[PDB]
């Protein structure tokens, strides 16, 4: 059903399949980066560079 | 289903190849020392 329809759409042609592969790689890398950045910020709270109480008092 | 599993794996492999190539190229590119000495 869903898998077969998507297969038709993105694999009727090999060039279209390669374009979809590149686009999906880009989007997946962006999503993984976003999720890992959210996890990193949630874990490391109060330790970021912007979180230093004094930044222009020198 | 098998083709789409392979497609996800190809997403992964393309990401790795792209980042490795860019890492090598940018390593051969300019460095922070010469960038800062420019002012």
């Amino acid at each position: 059903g869903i898998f077969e329809s998507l297969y038709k759409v993105v694999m009727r042609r090999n060039s279209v399949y390669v374009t979809f592969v590149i686009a999906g790689a880009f989007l997946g890398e962006r999503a993984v980066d976003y999720g890992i950045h959210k996890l990193w910020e949630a874990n490391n709270v109060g330790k970021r560079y912007e979180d230093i109480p004094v930044l222009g008092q020198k | 289903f098998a083709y789409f599993v392979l497609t996800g794996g190809r997403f992964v492999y393309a990401s790795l190849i792209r980042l490795l190539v860019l890492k090598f190229v940018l390593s051969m590119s300019a460095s922070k020392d010469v960038l800062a000495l420019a002012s």
Partner: peptide
Amino acid sequence: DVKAAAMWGVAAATGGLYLVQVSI
């Protein structure tokens, strides 16, 4: 084929924009 060549050119352009990533 003209259409096949055009689609392959589109795929190559997409790959180049994924590699270089000018203005994402």
